[PDB]
Design a protein around this motif. Structure first.
Motif, PDB file in Angstrom:
ATOM      1  N   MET D  41      40.660 -20.702 132.095  1.00 48.63           N
ATOM      2  CA  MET D  41      41.810 -21.610 132.338  1.00 48.63           C
ATOM      3  C   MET D  41      42.499 -22.221 131.207  1.00 48.63           C
ATOM      4  O   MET D  41      42.045 -22.677 130.174  1.00 48.63           O
ATOM      5  CB  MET D  41      41.232 -22.633 133.317  1.00 48.63           C
ATOM      6  N   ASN D  42      43.755 -22.093 131.425  1.00 56.24           N
ATOM      7  CA  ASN D  42      44.624 -22.959 130.073  1.00 56.24           C
ATOM      8  C   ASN D  42      44.485 -24.177 130.076  1.00 56.24           C
ATOM      9  O   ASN D  42      44.408 -25.041 131.272  1.00 56.24           O
ATOM     10  CB  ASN D  42      45.992 -22.468 130.359  1.00 56.24           C
ATOM     11  N   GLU D  43      44.923 -24.960 128.925  1.00 60.77           N
ATOM     12  CA  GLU D  43      44.734 -26.466 128.936  1.00 60.77           C
ATOM     13  C   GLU D  43      45.781 -26.925 129.917  1.00 60.77           C
ATOM     14  O   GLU D  43      45.714 -28.081 130.382  1.00 60.77           O
ATOM     15  CB  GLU D  43      44.823 -26.792 127.516  1.00 60.77           C
ATOM     16  N   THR D  44      47.160 -26.526 129.980  1.00 61.25           N
ATOM     17  CA  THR D  44      48.222 -27.151 130.440  1.00 61.25           C
ATOM     18  C   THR D  44      48.355 -26.262 131.866  1.00 61.25           C
ATOM     19  O   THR D  44      49.254 -26.650 132.669  1.00 61.25           O
ATOM     20  CB  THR D  44      49.547 -26.694 129.586  1.00 61.25           C
ATOM     21  N   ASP D  45      47.326 -25.507 132.334  1.00 64.04           N
ATOM     22  CA  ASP D  45      47.203 -24.980 133.665  1.00 64.04           C
ATOM     23  C   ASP D  45      48.483 -23.846 133.869  1.00 64.04           C
ATOM     24  O   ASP D  45      49.095 -23.928 135.132  1.00 64.04           O
ATOM     25  CB  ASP D  45      47.076 -25.957 134.835  1.00 64.04           C
ATOM     26  N   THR D  46      49.054 -23.132 132.885  1.00 65.16           N
ATOM     27  CA  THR D  46      50.356 -22.539 132.993  1.00 65.16           C
ATOM     28  C   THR D  46      50.072 -21.233 132.618  1.00 65.16           C
ATOM     29  O   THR D  46      50.789 -20.167 132.876  1.00 65.16           O
ATOM     30  CB  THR D  46      51.426 -22.904 131.995  1.00 65.16           C
ATOM     31  N   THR D  47      48.727 -20.599 132.138  1.00 61.65           N
ATOM     32  CA  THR D  47      48.280 -19.376 131.911  1.00 61.65           C
ATOM     33  C   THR D  47      47.063 -18.937 132.529  1.00 61.65           C
ATOM     34  O   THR D  47      46.082 -19.810 132.335  1.00 61.65           O
ATOM     35  CB  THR D  47      48.230 -19.093 130.393  1.00 61.65           C
ATOM     36  N   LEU D  48      46.843 -18.085 133.454  1.00 63.29           N
ATOM     37  CA  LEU D  48      45.766 -17.606 133.754  1.00 63.29           C
ATOM     38  C   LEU D  48      45.525 -16.140 133.864  1.00 63.29           C
ATOM     39  O   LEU D  48      46.242 -15.406 134.349  1.00 63.29           O
ATOM     40  CB  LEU D  48      45.649 -17.831 135.562  1.00 63.29           C
ATOM     41  N   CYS D  49      44.461 -15.751 132.935  1.00 63.47           N
ATOM     42  CA  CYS D  49      44.075 -14.402 132.378  1.00 63.47           C
ATOM     43  C   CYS D  49      42.714 -13.996 132.946  1.00 63.47           C
ATOM     44  O   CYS D  49      41.827 -14.928 132.436  1.00 63.47           O
ATOM     45  CB  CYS D  49      44.372 -14.193 130.864  1.00 63.47           C
ATOM     46  N   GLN D  50      42.502 -13.077 133.499  1.00 66.83           N
ATOM     47  CA  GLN D  50      41.089 -12.660 133.767  1.00 66.83           C
ATOM     48  C   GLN D  50      40.853 -11.403 133.676  1.00 66.83           C
ATOM     49  O   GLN D  50      41.718 -10.412 133.874  1.00 66.83           O
ATOM     50  CB  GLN D  50      40.777 -12.733 135.446  1.00 66.83           C
ATOM     51  N   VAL D  51      39.637 -10.887 132.837  1.00 69.76           N
ATOM     52  CA  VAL D  51      39.167  -9.702 132.570  1.00 69.76           C
ATOM     53  C   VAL D  51      38.184  -9.339 133.370  1.00 69.76           C
ATOM     54  O   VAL D  51      37.067  -9.820 133.294  1.00 69.76           O
ATOM     55  CB  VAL D  51      39.126  -9.504 131.137  1.00 69.76           C
ATOM     56  N   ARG D  52      38.363  -8.252 134.434  1.00 69.26           N
ATOM     57  CA  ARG D  52      37.028  -7.861 135.233  1.00 69.26           C
ATOM     58  C   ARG D  52      36.530  -6.563 134.804  1.00 69.26           C
ATOM     59  O   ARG D  52      37.321  -5.670 134.676  1.00 69.26           O
ATOM     60  CB  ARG D  52      37.712  -7.887 136.717  1.00 69.26           C
ATOM     61  N   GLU D 122      30.844 -23.848 138.786  1.00 67.81           N
ATOM     62  CA  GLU D 122      30.680 -23.969 140.455  1.00 67.81           C
ATOM     63  C   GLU D 122      31.407 -22.749 141.206  1.00 67.81           C
ATOM     64  O   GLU D 122      32.019 -23.222 142.106  1.00 67.81           O
ATOM     65  CB  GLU D 122      31.145 -25.232 140.897  1.00 67.81           C
ATOM     66  N   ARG D 123      31.425 -21.602 140.696  1.00 70.51           N
ATOM     67  CA  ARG D 123      32.199 -20.354 141.106  1.00 70.51           C
ATOM     68  C   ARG D 123      33.505 -20.850 141.593  1.00 70.51           C
ATOM     69  O   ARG D 123      33.781 -20.602 142.686  1.00 70.51           O
ATOM     70  CB  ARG D 123      31.443 -19.641 141.965  1.00 70.51           C
ATOM     71  N   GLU D 124      34.298 -21.353 140.618  1.00 69.19           N
ATOM     72  CA  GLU D 124      35.590 -21.690 140.774  1.00 69.19           C
ATOM     73  C   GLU D 124      36.572 -20.380 140.814  1.00 69.19           C
ATOM     74  O   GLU D 124      37.407 -20.267 139.766  1.00 69.19           O
ATOM     75  CB  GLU D 124      36.271 -22.953 139.920  1.00 69.19           C
ATOM     76  N   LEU D 125      36.570 -19.667 141.727  1.00 68.45           N
ATOM     77  CA  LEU D 125      36.946 -18.307 142.011  1.00 68.45           C
ATOM     78  C   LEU D 125      38.432 -18.593 142.530  1.00 68.45           C
ATOM     79  O   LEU D 125      38.987 -17.652 142.898  1.00 68.45           O
ATOM     80  CB  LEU D 125      36.175 -17.444 142.417  1.00 68.45           C
ATOM     81  N   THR D 126      38.660 -19.772 143.206  1.00 66.22           N
ATOM     82  CA  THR D 126      39.889 -19.931 143.765  1.00 66.22           C
ATOM     83  C   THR D 126      41.224 -19.413 143.271  1.00 66.22           C
ATOM     84  O   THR D 126      42.362 -19.131 143.592  1.00 66.22           O
ATOM     85  CB  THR D 126      40.408 -21.429 144.374  1.00 66.22           C
ATOM     86  N   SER D 127      41.287 -19.568 141.782  1.00 69.26           N
ATOM     87  CA  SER D 127      42.401 -19.008 141.108  1.00 69.26           C
ATOM     88  C   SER D 127      42.667 -17.658 140.866  1.00 69.26           C
ATOM     89  O   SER D 127      43.842 -17.097 141.138  1.00 69.26           O
ATOM     90  CB  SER D 127      41.961 -19.581 139.454  1.00 69.26           C
ATOM     91  N   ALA D 128      41.415 -16.893 141.020  1.00 70.72           N
ATOM     92  CA  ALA D 128      41.488 -15.460 141.335  1.00 70.72           C
ATOM     93  C   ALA D 128      42.106 -15.331 142.759  1.00 70.72           C
ATOM     94  O   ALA D 128      42.729 -13.952 143.040  1.00 70.72           O
ATOM     95  CB  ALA D 128      40.023 -14.797 141.021  1.00 70.72           C
ATOM     96  N   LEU D 129      41.550 -15.876 143.568  1.00 70.58           N
ATOM     97  CA  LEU D 129      42.037 -15.681 145.098  1.00 70.58           C
ATOM     98  C   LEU D 129      43.859 -15.774 144.895  1.00 70.58           C
ATOM     99  O   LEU D 129      44.545 -14.999 145.867  1.00 70.58           O
ATOM    100  CB  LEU D 129      41.668 -16.646 146.218  1.00 70.58           C
ATOM    101  N   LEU D 259      42.657  -5.860 134.420  1.00 72.34           N
ATOM    102  CA  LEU D 259      43.396  -6.661 133.693  1.00 72.34           C
ATOM    103  C   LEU D 259      44.399  -7.370 134.276  1.00 72.34           C
ATOM    104  O   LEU D 259      45.256  -6.884 134.769  1.00 72.34           O
ATOM    105  CB  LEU D 259      43.795  -6.128 132.058  1.00 72.34           C
ATOM    106  N   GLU D 260      44.476  -8.893 134.320  1.00 72.94           N
ATOM    107  CA  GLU D 260      45.334  -9.612 135.061  1.00 72.94           C
ATOM    108  C   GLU D 260      45.741 -10.482 134.248  1.00 72.94           C
ATOM    109  O   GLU D 260      45.090 -11.105 133.306  1.00 72.94           O
ATOM    110  CB  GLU D 260      44.457  -9.964 136.172  1.00 72.94           C
ATOM    111  N   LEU D 261      46.858 -11.092 134.630  1.00 77.96           N
ATOM    112  CA  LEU D 261      47.496 -12.279 133.737  1.00 77.96           C
ATOM    113  C   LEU D 261      48.746 -12.934 134.791  1.00 77.96           C
ATOM    114  O   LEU D 261      49.426 -12.459 135.128  1.00 77.96           O
ATOM    115  CB  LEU D 261      48.095 -11.878 132.590  1.00 77.96           C
TER     116      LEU D 261
END
Ligand SMILES: Nc1ncnc2c1ncn2[C@@H]1O[C@H](COP(=O)(O)OP(=O)(O)OP(O)(O)=S)[C@@H](O)[C@H]1O
Ligand SMILES: Nc1ncnc2c1ncn2[C@@H]1O[C@H](COP(=O)(O)OP(=O)(O)OP(O)(O)=S)[C@@H](O)[C@H]1O
Ligand SMILES: Nc1ncnc2c1ncn2[C@@H]1O[C@H](COP(=O)(O)OP(=O)(O)OP(O)(O)=S)[C@@H](O)[C@H]1O
Ligand SMILES: [Mg+2]
Ligand SMILES: [Mg+2]
Ligand SMILES: [Mg+2]
Lengths: 418, 162, 317, 266, 292, 269
Positions: D41-52, D122-129, D259-261
């Motif tokens: 998670m970005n510091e400013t909460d402006t970039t969300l990148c996940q590699v699965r 704490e499995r904070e996967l709400t961003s992926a949702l 790959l997601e962004l």
DNA sequence: GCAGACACTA
């Protein structure tokens, strides 16, 4: 276990320790900033530590952001992998810049990046200046909180320039940002005795079961009023109260003993201290308190300019002459700790001797040496221009002394007629 | 080696018995090294008393052939900053024995010119690494020394020569 | 390999530490309870601050403190970046600590640490105060910036009384089984001036150089402290007596002139019997003599002139 | 959990960790029975990148306690472990969680390196949702990689996705700022580019452009050519609903890597 | 000229002197001139000593005209010598000739280079006022704790990984097994946590490894040797093992470590000093964690 | 304010054109560089005020469709731009040397920005780069910043491009001086002449003497700084021969000649 | 520390 000041954090605007006027003029300031067009682009908060300079803004963002708790607090301890600390703050500003709609996250720069190296200190000025005059639609709120605390003296500081002397908003920020039209400077004051006493009442009645367990319910009033009157920091007061409550008893509590200000020291030297009747202990304690300010120039000049305000310039001319002579003699000791002690001691002794005729005093003024230096620089560049234009058509060598003394008035007079 | 040096550096003492005047200090140091305990000797006095000659003779007498390796000499001639005391002194006063289990002696000659931060680092060094390495401090002005350093060092006064 | 008495006989538990009964009792109580918040410990050197912190950490955690804490002292690179990174990693790495126990960050000699490091420590506390706690060991609280002290309970250690130092000396003597004399012990206490480490060093030197601890042996190995001699010199009535005291106590003993001037200034700052005008006149004369010494003239004549002018301003004809 | 990989797929794993370490200092990795998910998670909460990473990416997935265990590992500490040593190769690379992250490296020879980084569950996967909430633009990343390798990101400029009429006119430019009296305190060094109209695969009529950052746009493209994917390895896609307020979605479909962004615009 | 040494292949000299570059503020090398050859010794803060020996057969014009005890000393700088030979020996078939000269005592160290009708003469004034002599971080072979012989390539990878990760404090483990499953690794502790760089145990690149009982003749199995070494000492031998064939490890009960580098070939000997004491009682957990 | 010119690939002038890039790295490392576009074939560019003087002319007559016009009254126009951005256009153009001849280099002066047009092909890619700042200076500064200066006597003719070892000797001086981090030169009129460079330090005594080199009053001793490391990089000049002149014991010039244009560098005491 | 002006109930 858990810190008392952390477990008793305010939840509404009625629990924060702040004056009514301060709350009103920060609420009116933050309300107009959320508009698409705002008179002030950024908000600057300057004051002592523990003056609710950040929590007040925290609940303010809690009760203003959902109108259209979203706080983007800068973390200076971030590194960001292979990124320099100078560019980290630049990337943070652009990262939080793209929050003008939908999100609308307020920016609260509490922990500003450290500015001590030459490269990183100079970068901090234009980074926020570039964000001011940027012609971009909409504007996210940005609040900067700076704590007014003087940096303790260090060794081998070389030139011993500003900023490092006192960590304050005026020292680090330059003139362009200080009186910028799109900026509001809301100063903060230490927490009042009444508010501190009320908050300590609330904490004591919230911790009734713990205090009543020991023999502290009868003694609590004296301890809490002494704590409230001794210091103006709510966090330090809560820490001292928690330490005393945990303590079984028969323990003398301690306080930060925060340093006095510049004008406070000037008033102490000229008028005197009511807390310490003895003259010897007042100056000795003040030396070990802030030697970093006494062993510094312009303090003796401040004494020189404010010593005539003791009785609005209605005291002994012989005493004034003796005081000025003693300061002049102190000036010959090349700025030594012994030099500072003698002049201040003589000034205090004289003003104590003439303390009977001190019913009405005047206001003190910080010396205007910067203006004198500015006019000196302007006259220097004017003389340089005059020499440059006078040497392109003939020859004229008279050194700089004759230009200032003889050609400073005769030369413009002759060209006036011609 | 001889008949080619100034008279000042021609009669320099090489053993403890060749130092005159400060008989009490010599006897106390001899008792200290006979018992086998060096309590972080600190030497103070006017120039010409013979502090550095005494300490060099003592180190020679204790060590013998280990003076070249285990004895470290420090002065104002080389750089003595915060980095120097942070790295070189820490690296030297962290090693074990090589041939003999004697103590490690580090000579801080004219150490009164060090900065306050350097002095604080040096005294945190003397407190931490005292179980195997004992430092020696030589100075002529006690006002330039941090008062915390004087507490951790056994001060010996070098009187003028009688 | 005889370990010196300063390190061999250092306390390992808070019970053996004496000098401030209230503070030791408070430390024992807060260790038994376990709710130890941030604190700053300041005082004159040699009173038992860092050893008290170490003993408190020992008898508060035990194996956890021994194996899984990160204690930093003045003998490390105390840069902003490296200290920031180290304390940031140390704030993490939590273990199965007891509910009434927390990690302790021992900070020894923090007076010389840069302001940027203080700000980084401020951020570290405000971000991870729930898991770890900070302990400060220093000499004076002035070198610590103002915002740090607001988050901690400042504890001040008073100067050790003669009774506590004497009791510790008797305990160490009984442990070492060495003969002593009451006059020698009184001389040791007088020379220490409340400094425990200096007293231990002087007693060890007396034992290892003369055997039996006696006043004569202590006075032979170490002379009287110079602040007392200078204080007696400044309070002398006759100029000839002051001159004789100055000569026979500092010129014949090998004392530098600048050190004498500094000691005179320090005594005059802390003097109380003299009037304000006399005190400021003496301070001015001391400063004039100090700048004369600094400019090059470092002879006994300057000290004699300082004493003569001090006597003249004291008598006032 | 015990996952081992012994193939040429180690380079992309190291590439993805370095990409995630640039966005955030600490990388929070969530493990589940379905597959492995790594994101920061970005510091400013402006970039969300996940590699699965799919289960087929590894050779075994013996994961034991739908439970989603998570841990926060330092990005800089992790990115210096999965590195490929110069003049040598890693035959087997694996990461495991004991019941102290148990990661070891097995090189081609018998030399083995065992590392124990420290994590925090704490499995904070709400961003992926929100990422899978679900226009359509397809452009080849190979031609874009030429422009990304020379974008000169040291000035920290912005990217304006200018689709104009039909063709993608990618731009890397800096906005100028006025000084005291029309002064150029920050110089504007613009670097624009244009792609051919026929080169674009998918396009939607959405005249007027959007602005997004480049540092997160840089590292997301390097992951593609880093792994040698002869089969499949399709180009990235651009997905973003109307108005500049909402964030932009980017996806790179791979046979074993997801790959997601997501980057917030304005 | 009292000293002559002609060298054609300057590449070997260039890479030999390049092994002494990691020393900060490189200077004060005590070059030894002897009939056997030239030996370069450099010490930093009297905690690490490195010796680089050049044989007589390496030089084609070694004369060593002298009428003394065959023990002569000179002190010059490293950075001057290190950059002196690396600059030339470029292009192809240049057959650059390097000439060494030293007029006994008190004369500058003369270096002569010839490259395609281009001549240079470089002089290095020596520093021989307070040369304390003797010195030497040597050790006795009668009480060697253990000995190990490993390949340079295997150790270079371990040291290279040890440096960039950090690991300001490093540990050396030696343990033999009756089933020939010898254990030897360079493990360390850093801000990352625990790093276990386990060196291989097979005989393919680990030639020999045995642990003694302080007598260098009584080999014992199942005993463990733990060495606590500073990272700064390990960083110096990283580039020395970059170009090498076999690396020899030998340390005694006193704690000093002797490292021999083989690359006729030249020999490089590096001596190291053990740290004061094991942190806490980590010697217990090193055995416990690795055995698990 | 129409400053439009086209740069195209060729066979001969590319080496002269690619020689421009080496200074651009140095010029970007320096403060900035000035320009003076004149007529159709003459323009002078140098580093404004170390002592960096790089008077060098380029024959824009071979360049296609170049024209200069400005409001500076006289034929000389002051021009200055930051050289850091000049690296980007040259480096990226160097990657497309494999294919592409019709891409050209279209430059247009508009007000501040200088659009650069590219037509690289991988199906064609259009790149439009803009030069950030083209800010001018005062008209009176043109006279006070005149870069035209030259001297005579004591002409050292360099070794002709027959043996490549001569350049490697100068390139050896580039690498060594960077590694150590005064320079003295000798001059003789006795015929071919010999070159001698000697460095004097407290303990470092470097001297280089040339026995039989093919290069072509006397005893011209001179002590100067280490700024000559730039001039050695200009000696490459694979197309033509380079000239060097050193006299008066205070100043030295390095006349690099390539095609019609010439490049000189000035060093003060 | 102190001068000028305001809040708030005794
Ligand atoms: N009634 C209260 N009003 C204000 N603060 C309170 C109150 N009760 C508890 N606190 C705590 O007191 C502290 C005051 O925080 P602030 O002063 O706003 O922080 P700060 O001003 O940024 O301090 P510095 O100078 O940056 S370290 C916080 O930790 C609050 O949780
Ligand atoms: N007690 C002594 N007996 C004999 N010679 C002495 C004695 N004290 C000093 N000297 C001589 O004085 C010379 C210089 O004194 P040093 O011991 O080198 O310096 P120092 O006396 O310690 O003063 P400082 O603090 O170094 S300036 C020595 O080399 C001896 O020759
Ligand atoms: N109350 C005490 N009882 C017994 N020994 C003490 C006591 N206080 C100090 N000491 C001794 O003092 C020596 C070191 O004490 P320290 O705590 O290091 O001094 P300090 O008061 O912390 O001053 P600094 O700032 O560290 S120099 C050891 O030998 C201790 O045994
Ligand atoms: Mg706050
Ligand atoms: Mg000496
Ligand atoms: Mg301490």
């Amino acid at each position: 276990g858990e810190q008392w000041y952390e477990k008793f954090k305010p939840n509404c605007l009625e629990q924060v320790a702040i004056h009514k006027r301060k709350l009103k003029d920060v609420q009116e300031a933050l309300d107009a900033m959320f508009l698409p067009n705002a008179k002030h682009r950024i908000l600057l908060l300057s004051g002592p530590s523990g003056c609710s300079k950040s929590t007040v803004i925290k609940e303010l963002s809690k009760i203003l952001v959902p109108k259209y708790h979203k706080v983007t607090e800068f973390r200076g301890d971030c590194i960001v992998n292979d990124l320099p600390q100078m560019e980290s703050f630049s990337e943070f500003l652009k990262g939080a810049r793209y929050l003008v709609m939908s999100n609308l996250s307020l920016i609260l720069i509490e922990d500003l990046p450290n500015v001590f190296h030459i490269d990183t200190r100079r970068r901090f000025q234009q980074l926020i200046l570039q964000w001011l005059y940027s012609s971009e639609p909409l504007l996210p709120p940005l609040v900067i909180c700076i704590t007014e605390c003087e940096i303790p003296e260090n060794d081998n500081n070389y030139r011993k320039f500003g900023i490092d002397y006192t960590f304050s908003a005026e020292t680090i920020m330059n003139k362009e940002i200080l009186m910028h039209p799109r900026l509001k400077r809301i100063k903060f004051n230490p927490i009042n005795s009444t508010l501190l006493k009320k908050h300590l009442k609330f904490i004591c009645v919230q911790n009734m079961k713990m205090l009543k367990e020991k023999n502290k319910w009868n003694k609590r009033q004296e301890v809490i009023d002494y704590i409230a009157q001794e210091t103006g920091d709510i966090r330090s007061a809560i820490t001292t109260l928690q330490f005393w409550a945990t303590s079984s008893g028969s323990l003398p509590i301690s306080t930060r003993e925060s340093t006095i200000s510049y004008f406070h020291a000037i008033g102490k030297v000229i008028h005197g201290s009511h807390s310490t009747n003895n003259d010897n202990e007042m100056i000795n304690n003040l030396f070990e308190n802030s030697n970093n300010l006494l062993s510094k120039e312009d303090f003796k000049l401040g004494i020189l300019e404010n010593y005539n305000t003791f009785n609005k310039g209605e005291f002994s001319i012989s005493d004034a002459s003796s005081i000025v002579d003693c300061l002049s003699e102190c000036d010959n000791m090349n700025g030594l700790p012994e030099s500072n002690e003698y002049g201040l001691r003589e000034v205090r002794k004289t003003f104590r001797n003439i303390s009977k005729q001190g019913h009405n005093h005047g206001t003190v003024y910080f010396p205007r040496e910067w203006k004198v230096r500015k006019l000196q620089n302007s006259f220097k560049v004017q003389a340089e221009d005059w020499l440059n234009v006078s040497l392109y058509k003939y020859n004229a060598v008279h050194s700089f002394r004759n230009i200032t003394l003889e050609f400073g008035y005769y030369a413009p007079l002759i060209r006036k007629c011609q | 080696s001889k008949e080619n040096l100034p008279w000042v550096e021609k009669y320099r003492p090489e053993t403890l018995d060749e130092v005159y005047g400060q008989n009490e200090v010599i006897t106390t140091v001899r008792k200290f090294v006979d018992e086998g305990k060096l309590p972080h000797l600190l030497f103070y006095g006017p120039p010409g008393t013979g502090k550095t000659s005494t300490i060099v003779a003592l180190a020679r007498e204790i060590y013998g052939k280990n003076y070249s390796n285990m004895v470290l000499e420090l002065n104002a001639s080389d750089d003595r900053g915060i980095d120097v005391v942070r790295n070189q002194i820490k690296d030297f006063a962290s090693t074990r024995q090589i041939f003999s289990k004697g103590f490690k002696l580090i000579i801080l000659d004219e150490a009164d010119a060090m900065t306050n931060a350097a002095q604080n680092a040096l005294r945190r060094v003397i407190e931490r690494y005292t179980k195997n390495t004992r430092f020696c401090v030589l100075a002529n002005y006690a006002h330039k020394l941090t008062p915390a350093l004087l507490s951790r060092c056994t001060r010996f006064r070098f009187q003028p020569l009688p | 390999l005889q370990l010196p008495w300063v390190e061999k006989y250092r306390p390992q538990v808070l019970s053996d530490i004496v000098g401030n009964k209230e503070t030791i009792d408070r430390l024992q109580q807060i260790a038994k309870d376990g709710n130890m918040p941030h604190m700053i410990i300041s005082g004159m050197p040699g009173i038992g601050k860092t050893t008290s912190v170490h003993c408190l950490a020992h008898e508060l955690l035990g194996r956890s403190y021994a194996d899984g804490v990160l204690e930093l002292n003045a003998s490390d690179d105390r840069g902003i970046d490296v200290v920031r990174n180290q304390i940031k990693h140390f704030a993490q790495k939590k273990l199965h600590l007891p509910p009434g126990k927390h990690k302790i960050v021992i900070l020894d000699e923090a007076d010389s640490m840069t302001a940027g490091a203080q700000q980084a420590l401020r951020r570290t506390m405000e971000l991870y105060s729930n898991s770890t706690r900070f302990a400060f060991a220093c000499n004076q609280s002035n070198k610590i910036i103002e915002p740090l002290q607001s988050r901690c309970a400042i504890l001040r250690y008073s100067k050790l009384s003669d009774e506590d130092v004497l009791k510790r000396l008797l305990q160490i003597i009984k442990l070492e089984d060495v003969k002593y004399t009451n006059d020698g012990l009184e001389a040791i206490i007088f020379t220490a001036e409340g400094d425990m480490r200096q007293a231990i060093n002087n007693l060890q030197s007396t034992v290892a150089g003369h055997g039996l601890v006696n006043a004569d042996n202590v006075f032979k190995i170490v002379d009287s402290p110079h602040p007392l001699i200078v204080k007696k010199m400044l309070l002398a009535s006759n100029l000839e007596d002051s001159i004789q005291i100055l000569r026979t106590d500092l010129w014949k003993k090998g004392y530098s002139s600048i050190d004498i001037v500094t000691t005179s200034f320090r005594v005059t700052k802390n003097l109380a019997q003299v009037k304000e005008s006399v005190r400021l006149e003496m301070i001015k004369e001391i400063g004039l003599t100090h700048m004369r010494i600094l400019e090059g003239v470092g002879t006994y004549l300057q000290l004699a002139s300082m004493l003569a002018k001090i006597h003249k301003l004291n008598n006032k004809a | 959990k015990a996952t081992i990989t012994e193939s040429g797929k180690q380079n992309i794993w190291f590439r993805a960790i370095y990409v995630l370490s640039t966005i955030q200092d600490d990388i929070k990795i969530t493990v589940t029975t379905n597959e492995l998910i790594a994101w920061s998670m970005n510091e400013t909460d402006t970039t969300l990148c996940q590699v699965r990473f799919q289960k087929s990416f590894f050779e075994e997935y013996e994961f034991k306690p739908h439970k989603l265990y998570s841990f926060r590992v330092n990005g800089r500490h992790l990115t210096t472990i999965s590195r490929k040593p110069d003049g040598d190769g890693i035959k087997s690379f694996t990461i495991a969680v004991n019941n102290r992250l148990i990661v070891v490296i097995e090189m081609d020879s018998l030399i083995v390196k065992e590392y124990c980084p420290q994590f925090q569950p704490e499995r904070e996967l709400t961003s992926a949702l929100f990422n899978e909430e679900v226009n359509y633009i397809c452009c080849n990343s190979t031609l874009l990689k030429n422009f990304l390798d020379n974008c000169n990101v040291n000035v920290t400029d912005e990217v304006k996705l200018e689709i104009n009429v039909h063709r993608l006119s990618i731009t890397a430019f800096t906005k100028a700022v006025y000084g005291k009296n029309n002064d150029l305190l920050r110089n504007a060094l613009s670097m624009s580019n244009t792609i051919s109209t026929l080169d674009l695969e998918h396009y939607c009529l959405f005249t007027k452009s959007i602005i997004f950052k480049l540092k997160d746009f840089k590292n997301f493209i390097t992951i593609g050519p880093s792994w040698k994917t002869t089969q499949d390895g399709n180009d990235n896609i651009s997905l973003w609903f109307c108005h500049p307020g909402d964030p932009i979605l980017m996806q790179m479909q791979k046979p074993g890597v997801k790959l997601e962004l997501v980057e917030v615009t304005d | 000229n009292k000293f002559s040494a002609s060298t054609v292949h300057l590449e070997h000299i260039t890479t030999a002197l390049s092994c002494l570059t990691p020393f900060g503020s490189k200077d004060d090398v005590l070059i030894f001139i002897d009939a056997d050859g030239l030996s370069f010794v450099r010490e930093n803060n009297h905690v690490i000593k490195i010796q680089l020996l050049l044989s007589r057969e390496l030089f084609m014009s070694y004369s060593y005209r002298n009428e003394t005890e065959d023990h002569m000393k000179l002190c010059v700088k490293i950075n001057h010598i290190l950059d002196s030979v690396s600059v030339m020996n470029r292009n192809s078939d240049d057959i650059v000739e390097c000439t060494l000269s030293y007029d006994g005592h008190g004369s500058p160290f003369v270096l002569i280079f010839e490259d395609s009708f281009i001549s240079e003469r470089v002089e290095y004034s020596t520093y021989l006022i307070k040369d304390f002599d003797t010195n030497g971080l040597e050790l006795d072979r009668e009480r060697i704790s253990f000995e190990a012989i490993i390949k340079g390539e295997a150790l270079h990878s371990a040291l290279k990984d040890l440096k960039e990760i950090g690991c300001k404090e490093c540990y050396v483990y030696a343990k033999t097994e009756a089933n020939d499953e010898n254990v030897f690794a360079l493990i360390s502790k850093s801000q990352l946590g625990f790093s276990k760089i386990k060196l291989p145990s097979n005989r393919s690149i680990l030639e020999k490894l045995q642990v003694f009982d302080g007598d260098s003749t009584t080999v014992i199995d199942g005993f463990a040797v733990i060495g606590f070494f500073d990272f700064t000492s390990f960083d110096k031998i990283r580039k020395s093992t970059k170009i090498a064939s076999k690396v020899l490890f030998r340390m005694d009960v006193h704690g000093v470590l002797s490292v021999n580098i083989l690359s006729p070939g030249i020999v490089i000997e590096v001596c190291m000093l053990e740290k004061e004491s094991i942190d806490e009682a980590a010697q217990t957990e090193i055995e416990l964690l690795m055995e698990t | 304010m129409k400053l439009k010119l086209i740069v195209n690939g060729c066979e001969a002038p590319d080496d002269y054109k690619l020689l421009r890039t080496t200074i651009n790295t140095v010029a970007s490392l320096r403060k900035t560089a000035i320009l003076r576009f004149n007529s159709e074939r003459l323009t002078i560019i140098s580093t404004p005020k170390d002592t960096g003087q790089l008077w060098c002319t380029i024959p824009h007559d071979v360049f296609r469709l170049y024209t200069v016009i400005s409001a500076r009254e006289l034929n000389t126009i002051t021009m200055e731009c930051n050289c850091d951005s000049l690296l980007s256009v040259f480096k990226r153009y160097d990657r497309v040397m494999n294919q592409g001849s019709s891409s050209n280099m279209t430059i247009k002066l508009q007000s501040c920005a200088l659009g650069i047009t590219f037509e690289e092909i991988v199906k064609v890619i259009m790149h439009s780069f803009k030069v950030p700042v083209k800010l001018l200076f005062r008209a009176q500064d043109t006279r006070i910043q005149e870069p035209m200066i030259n001297y005579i006597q004591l002409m050292m003719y360099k070794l002709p491009p027959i043996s490549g070892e001569f350049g490697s000797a100068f390139h050896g001086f580039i690498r060594r001086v960077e590694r150590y981090s005064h320079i003295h030169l000798m001059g003789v009129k006795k015929k071919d002449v010999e070159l001698k460079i000697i460095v004097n330090e407290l303990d470092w005594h470097l001297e280089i003497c040339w026995n039989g080199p093919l290069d072509s009053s006397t005893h011209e001793v001179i002590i100067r700084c280490k700024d000559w490391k730039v001039c050695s990089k200009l000696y490459a000049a694979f197309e033509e021969v380079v000239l060097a002149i050193s006299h008066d014991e205070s100043c030295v010039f390095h006349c690099s000649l390539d095609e019609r244009g010439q490049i000189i560098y000035y060093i003060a005491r």
